């Protein structure tokens, strides 16, 4: 019935349907089969008469595909077999972009340019060498994380089960689209949704707040809060600012454990796996005592000096 | 029970409640009574026992108050009598701001500044004379009108009863807040809501697309489409561009009368009272033949050369 398929404007954590029917499962080299951000269901069955099999095609970019697609490495182009043709375009997101790159962009990653409205004429003598064949101070912290944290500061310090309750999937999308296209005056959604988007953000980061190269150093000094401060100072500029900003926010949260039910241990446990992660290419084993050190490393700042 | 009242962050076409009770109507000089963007209901009644009268206080800035508040002339400060104290703050809107001022602002009128994130130190020797006691090319068209019109171009040319059906009051608010704080990638709401916000925008303008000083000239030449083009050329830069842009959009709409049900006469009648208005201080009479000329003036461009 249908053969050609295109998914226009695909975005992080947004599902797109492309239902269709069949009437009367293969996979090419599973190395060239399909794409992780794409799958079929039902992708196989039994038929013999005229009965129509309404097989659906869905795409969903998760934390595992967001960063390759952002950069461009991968594109919304996948080839199946039965050959199948499908394409579209992927809209970049601040989620899955380095803190480094984000601190250099004062505007949303997808802000609409007003270029076609500007009333002027660039130097024509400057284009005397142009051709159709010939193609500053970084922010202390990404505005995106700032918008999320400042919001929680202002409206969620007294939120019950804060960082224990999962937000609304639908509000998470809004929040994401919001940060990708504007510097909102008010982040939409409930405190739970905003709190989760922050975790999702820290998790999708290409390079953790605490750089991989410093991962082990932190573990080794986890019990000496003074040495931990020093390791932090070793981090690149924006990583250290983002780290310090988060600890300040989390400490502020503790002052209201009475109302929000957050305790140092819970918080430190929750955030450490997002902030302090092992170099993935070393497929390093995660010992239970290494887990305690990773937790202690954060507790040091949440109760330190 | 309550005496002090404050309405924080009041905005164009957004109602704010401030309910309270009483138990056991006056007005100061009605010249100093209350403010049009404020009223009471119930504002009078009968009582003698302990019964509590839950009188509500509401504020609503409409097309008549938006522009004075934007500029600042008026502030959310009104004094009642029984003396009553109430205040707050008003957030400016692009709705009710001149086309002149809007073409000079490349950013939303209320975009969140990222100043407190910037990582740098301004010249301290430049502040060697500073003191706590001592305080470029305009766009061809306001981005706000551009965002509204381009949206209708892209998604509403085939909308049924377009410009005949009123949008959702709740979506109109969103759209307004959207344009005031961001350069949206996608205006929220249905085509009917977007179409109405455009009318609301043209109506709240401080100075009509066609300047008051040229109002009569247009009427006088309404039957000579060639002279009408010339009068348009007389308009200040941005007013002529906005006018031409609108006519192009409306003509495009006519090419699909079949689908959207819009006809030149309906359109021209609807838009002329928004685009071509009489200098209000002349309390000029609106004769039925002057109404036909005002309509003809627009028809000339919708069917002209």
């Amino acid at each position: 019935s249908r053969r050609e398929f295109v998914f226009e404007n695909v975005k992080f954590r947004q599902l797109q349907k492309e239902k269709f029917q069949i009437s009367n499962i293969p996979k090419l080299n599973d190395s060239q089969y399909c794409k992780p951000w794409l799958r079929a269901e039902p992708f196989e069955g039994y038929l013999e008469p005229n009965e129509t099999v309404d097989i659906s095609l869905d795409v969903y970019v998760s934390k595992d595909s967001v960063t390759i697609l952002n950069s461009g490495e991968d594109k919304i182009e996948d080839i199946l077999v039965l050959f199948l043709t499908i394409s579209g375009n992927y809209l970049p997101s601040c989620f899955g972009t380095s803190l480094e790159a984000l601190c250099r962009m004062k505007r949303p990653i997808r802000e609409v340019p007003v270029t076609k409205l500007i009333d002027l004429e660039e130097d024509s003598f400057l284009e005397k060498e142009k051709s159709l064949l010939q193609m500053e101070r970084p922010l202390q912290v990404p505005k995106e994380i700032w918008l999320l944290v400042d919001h929680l500061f202002k409206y969620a310090c007294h939120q019950e089960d804060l960082f224990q309750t999962p937000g609304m999937q639908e509000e998470l999308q809004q929040i994401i689209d919001c940060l990708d296209t504007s510097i909102p005056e008010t982040i939409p959604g409930s405190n739970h949704s905003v709190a989760e988007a922050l975790l999702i953000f820290l998790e999708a980061l290409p390079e953790p707040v605490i750089c991989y190269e410093l991962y082990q150093r932190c573990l080794d000094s986890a019990y000496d809060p003074r040495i931990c401060r020093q390791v932090i100072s070793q981090l690149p500029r924006c990583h250290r600012n983002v780290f310090r900003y988060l600890m300040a926010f989390l400490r502020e949260l503790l002052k209201f454990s009475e109302y929000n039910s957050v305790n140092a241990n819970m918080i430190a446990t929750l955030f450490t796996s997002l902030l302090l992660r092992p170099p993935p290419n070393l497929m390093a084993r995660q010992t239970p005592s290494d887990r305690q050190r990773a937790i202690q490393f954060l507790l040091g700042f949440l109760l330190g000096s």
Side-chain angles (χ1 to χ4, degrees), chain A residues 21-73:
Chain A
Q21 54 290 297
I22 298 182
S23 61
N24 62 176
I25 175 176
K27 322 168 301 177
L28 315 76
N29 306 59
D30 214 299
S31 308
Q32 313 288 302
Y33 171 34
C34 91
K35 292 276 59 61
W37 44 260
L38 171 60
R39 72 94 182 74
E41 192 179 7
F43 74 119
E44 112 284 86
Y46 295 117
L47 233 71
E48 52 289 299
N50 293 298
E51 51 179 356
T52 56
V53 178
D54 303 298
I55 157 186
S56 185
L57 278 172
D58 307 342
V59 290
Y60 184 97
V61 174
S62 72
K63 45 174 168 296
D64 289 338
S65 322
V66 69
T67 173
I68 45 178
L69 289 173
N70 280 338
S71 55
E73 311 302 64

Side-chain angles (χ1 to χ4, degrees), chain A residues 214 227-237 240 244:
Chain A
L214 289 173
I227 299 193
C228 283
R229 296 193 201 88
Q230 188 149 52
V231 178
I232 292 297
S233 55
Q234 322 295 66
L235 291 167
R237 234 282 167 177
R240 76 170 71 111
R244 284 160 174 168

Side-chain angles (χ1 to χ4, degrees), chain A residues 69-264:
Chain A
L69 289 173
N70 280 338
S71 55
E73 311 302 64
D74 184 48
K75 261 74 177 188
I76 57 300
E77 297 175 359
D78 188 55
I79 309 301
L80 303 180
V81 62
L82 278 186
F83 293 122
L84 266 183
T85 60
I86 56 82
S87 60
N89 64 297
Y90 169 71
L91 296 175
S93 172
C94 55
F95 284 70
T97 304
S98 69
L99 293 170
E100 208 70 289
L102 289 167
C103 291
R104 290 157 180 60
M105 44 188 285
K106 282 58 153 39
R107 304 271 90 224
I109 188 164
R110 264 154 49 209
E111 188 175 61
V112 183
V114 297
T115 297
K116 302 185 70 62
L117 287 62
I118 297 180
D119 181 61
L120 88 322
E121 279 296 0
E122 305 76 8
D123 189 58
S124 60
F125 296 61
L126 190 59
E127 303 174 57
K128 203 268 282 61
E129 26 282 348
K130 190 182 67 60
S131 173
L132 301 167
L133 293 176
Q134 295 179 298
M135 283 296 276
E136 261 294 302
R137 303 96 68 177
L139 313 171
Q140 303 176 219
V141 138
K143 55 191 187 299
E144 297 76 32
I145 194 161
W146 174 65
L147 287 165
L148 291 174
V149 168
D150 189 76
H151 183 284
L152 295 168
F153 253 126
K154 285 184 166 55
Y155 318 97
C157 290
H158 301 75
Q159 181 49 256
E160 305 186 308
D161 316 314
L162 209 255
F163 285 113
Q164 292 187 183
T165 311
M168 303 291 288
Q169 220 71 173
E170 197 67 359
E171 299 186 335
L172 296 169
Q173 166 60 199
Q174 289 185 281
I175 296 178
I176 287 163
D177 251 355
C178 174
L179 302 182
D180 289 343
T181 65
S182 65
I183 307 180
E185 170 183 80
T186 294
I187 300 295
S190 63
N191 299 331
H192 284 141
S193 298
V194 176
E196 204 185 333
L198 175 57
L199 301 181
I200 287 172
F201 187 91
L202 296 173
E203 171 186 65
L205 243 20
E207 181 75 45
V209 175
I210 288 170
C211 296
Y212 293 130
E213 49 265 49
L214 289 173
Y215 172 81
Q216 191 58 53
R217 282 190 61 178
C218 292
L219 255 35
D220 296 347
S221 40
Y223 293 113
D224 196 325
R226 189 254 296 170
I227 299 193
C228 283
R229 296 193 201 88
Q230 188 149 52
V231 178
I232 292 297
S233 55
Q234 322 295 66
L235 291 167
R237 234 282 167 177
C238 60
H239 279 250
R240 76 170 71 111
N241 296 330
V242 169
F243 184 87
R244 284 160 174 168
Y245 181 48
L246 291 182
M247 289 311 96
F249 165 61
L250 294 180
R251 287 203 242 64
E252 194 66 45
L253 234 44
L254 275 337
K255 301 178 186 168
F256 304 105
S257 46
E258 177 187 298
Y259 311 68
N260 54 42
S261 317
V262 313
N263 66 62

